[PDB]
Design a binder for these strands. Structure first.
Ligand SMILES: CC1=N/C(=C\c2cc(F)c(O)c(F)c2)C(=O)N1CC(F)(F)F
Ligand SMILES: [K+]
Lengths: 214, 223
RNA sequence: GGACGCGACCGAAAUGGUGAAGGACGGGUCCAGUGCGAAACACGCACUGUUGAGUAGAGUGUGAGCUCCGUAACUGGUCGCGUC
């Protein structure tokens, strides 16, 4: 039976200097063969702790590992700005090896309302058979935002995809893009294309939109 | 000093095969245990295979056993991962990691490659169509205006976007690619600018998709 | 009385044969675990473990001891006989 590594939480927000703790619980006994890694977006993992509690060479001492039976914990005594990334646990007591599902630690900050923009499909794309309408939520926090599409006051569903950036390195804000995809035919049948944004930092839900013809 | 460099990644249709390399430097692979670990886009780390020193014993995960084969060429100081009968769920970034010296790092992987991308799909390689996200004509939003470029229907990953050839970097957001139901990727890059100079100043997104020899430059003007 | 000699019985270092004992007679080997050798397995070393292992040996020891049957040095004891 494969050994399971149940990591938790899956996500975490904390301020700089905070004391945080990430846990991985093993399904079987893995002794002390537990390693902790750090991974930043687009980069390879970096070894932090080995053998449950041993601190790799060159790793800051604010990182610490501990084993309690089959439960292992990574502890960051005081968060620093360069510490915000994703952390995985690993067991190498037996093959196959097992990784935790990761724990993304994100920096907290003051609430920031998103700036909303809507972009109609280009004439160049419309002559291609497809129309793409983009709604842009720019520089907001927290990430929790709701975006809905309304063509002629008709709530859309199933024909939109969202994409969000990593937490910005400067202001620690998010930016998001909703992309509505319609046929040239269906795009021609209606006039008012709407996207409504609901965010914590907004006084009330904000609607941004245009008319197809004008 | 120590470094790992994987190569050979690319696009291959399902059932196909691909051979990955893991060029080592700063150390001899003969004295260490080499591992392959992959990471599908958005997901976590998954142990693929490994090979033990002195004995040459190999180990594989169930998801890849029978299809993947890990080896080591001491003559080239390079580890290889032969992937046969590839599937769509094999699509991920592939790392090669060294198992550090026992008395020093236990069984931890102390050094990792930059990773090489392996995409498995039936989709043909295709350059992206770049469309302008023209800046609105009316008012503002947050105090400024916004514009950008839509990079749609390209495959496979990745693609790079710059503005004014790297001259424009402030207020620029390039969103993560999204795999469309068509099997093709798509993403948009935007940027916030002053609404007062939308006409007198020039903005140009520099799109770059090497897998298809497709480099485009579109300027984004008020419509 | 005692001494010397011969012989017998006994004892006896030593030795050949014999047949029971398994870890409280040992060594070897294997197994498990831990650490070490650039070393998760295989290989090697070290440590630990017999509530880990066959007294049909699964040993290029079934080695020591003992059971039982013989041979036997002798500086041994006892007894008889001869002599002084
Ligand atoms: C079959 C067997 N058992 C053995 C040994 C042993 C040593 C002990 F100290 C102990 O208490 C025990 F029960 C057995 C042993 O050495 N073998 C040999 C082999 F065939 F396995 F190689
Ligand atoms: K024995």
């Amino acid at each position: 039976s494969d050994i399971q590594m149940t990591q938790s939480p899956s996500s975490l927000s904390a301020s700089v200097g905070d004391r945080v703790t990430i846990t991985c619980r093993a399904s079987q006994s893995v002794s002390s063969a537990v390693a902790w890694y750090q991974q930043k977006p687009g980069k390879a993992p970096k070894l932090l702790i080995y053998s449950a509690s041993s601190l790799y060479s060159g790793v800051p001492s604010r990182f610490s590992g501990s084993r309690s039976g089959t439960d292992f914990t990574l502890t960051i005594s005081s968060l620093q700005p360069e510490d915000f990334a994703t952390y995985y646990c690993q067991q190498s007591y037996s093959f196959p090896s097992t990784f935790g599902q990761g724990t993304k630690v994100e920096i907290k900050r003051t609430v920031a309302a998103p700036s909303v923009f809507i972009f109609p499909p280009s004439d160049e794309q419309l002559k291609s058979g497809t129309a793409s309408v983009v709604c842009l939520l720019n520089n907001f926090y927290p990430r929790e935002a709701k975006v809905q599409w309304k063509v002629d006051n008709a709530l859309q569903s199933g024909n939109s995809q969202e994409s969000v950036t990593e937490q910005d390195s400067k202001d620690s804000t998010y930016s998001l893009s909703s992309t509505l995809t319609l046929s040239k035919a269906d795009y021609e049948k209606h006039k008012v294309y709407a996207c409504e944004v609901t965010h914590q930092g907004l006084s009330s839900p904000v609607t941004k939109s245009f008319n197809r013809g004008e | 000093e120590v470094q790992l460099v994987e190569s050979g990644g690319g696009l291959v249709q399902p059932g196909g095969s691909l051979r990955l390399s893991c060029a080592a430097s700063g150390f001899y692979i003969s004295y260490s245990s080499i591992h392959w670990v992959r990471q599908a886009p958005g997901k976590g780390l998954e142990w693929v295979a490994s090979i033990s020193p002195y004995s040459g014993s190999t180990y594989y995960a169930d998801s890849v056993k029978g299809r993947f084969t890990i080896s080591a060429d001491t003559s080239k100081n390079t580890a290889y991962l032969q992937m046969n009968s590839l599937r769509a769920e094999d699509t991920a970034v592939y790392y090669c990691a060294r198992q550090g010296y026992r008395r020093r790092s236990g069984r931890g992987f102390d050094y990792w490659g930059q990773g090489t991308l392996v995409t498995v799909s039936s989709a043909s390689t295709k350059g992206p169509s770049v469309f302008p996200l023209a800046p609105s004509s009316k008012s503002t939003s947050g105090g400024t205006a916004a514009l950008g470029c839509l990079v749609k229907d390209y495959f496979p990953e990745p693609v790079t976007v710059s503005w004014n050839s790297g001259a424009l970097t402030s207020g620029v957001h390039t969103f993560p690619a999204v795999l469309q139901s068509s099997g093709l990727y798509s993403l948009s890059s935007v940027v916030t600018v002053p609404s007062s100079s939308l006409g007198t100043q020039t903005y140009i997104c520099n799109v770059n998709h090497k897998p298809s020899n497709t480099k485009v430059d579109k300027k984004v003007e008020p419509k």
